[PDB]
C-alpha cells in the first residue's frame with residue numbers, strides 16, 4: 001500500500017505552476033495550458049524506497065476559492081511556492097504566498113520549497129543569490145526548475161516530500 005502526500009502548488013499566474021505539474025505527471029511540456037483550470041492530480045512514485053501517492057493541487061487565479069482549494073490549503077502537507085526567474089514581480093509576490101500559508105497553518109514551520117521556474121529562458125531578472133537570500137530567511141530549500149527541459153522538476157517535488165517527512169511522521 002501507498003503513503004499519500006498532499007501537495008499544493010501556489011504562486012502568481014503565469015510562472016509555470018501548471019507546466020511543472022504536467023511535466024511531473026505526464027513527462028511533457030505544455031506551452032498554452034488554460035490559465036484558469038484548477039484541479040488535483042495523482043501520481044504514484046517511489047521516493048527513497050517508499051511507494052507514494054502524491055495528491056497535488058495546481059492552483060489557478062485568486063477568484064473566490066472552491067471548497068476543494070480551501071480544503072487543500074487547510075489540509076495540505078507541503079507547498080511549492082513558485083516564481084519565474086524572468087518575472088521579478090512573481091518573485092516579489094512570494095512574500096504574499098508565504099504569508100497566506102503561515103496564516104492558514106498558524107505556523108512559521110510549514111513544509112515548503114521555493115521554486116524558481118523557467119530556468120531555460122535567457123531573460124533572467126531574479127538572480128540565484130536573491131532567491132537564496134529569500135529561502136534562507138524562510139528556512140526552506142530553493143530549487144530552480146524548467147518545465148520545458150524537465151531540469152529540477154522531480155527534484156522540487158521530491159524535496160517537498162522530504163521536507164514533509166522532516167516535519168512529521170508519514
Ligand SMILES: Nc1nc2c(ncn2[C@@H]2O[C@H](COP(=O)(O)OP(=O)(O)O)[C@@H](O)[C@H]2O)c(=O)[nH]1
Pocket residue numbers: 012013014015016017018019020030031032033034035117118119120121145146147148149
Ligand atoms: N520556457 C519556459 N516556458 C514555461 C515554463 N513553464 C511554463 N512556461 C510557459 O509559461 C506560460 C505559463 O505557464 P503555466 O503553466 O500556464 O503557468 P501558471 O499560470 O503558473 O499555471 C505558458 O506559456 C508556459 O508554456 C518553463 O519552464 N520554461
Ligand SMILES: [Mg+2]
Pocket residue numbers: 017018019033034035036037058059060
Ligand atoms: Mg495554471
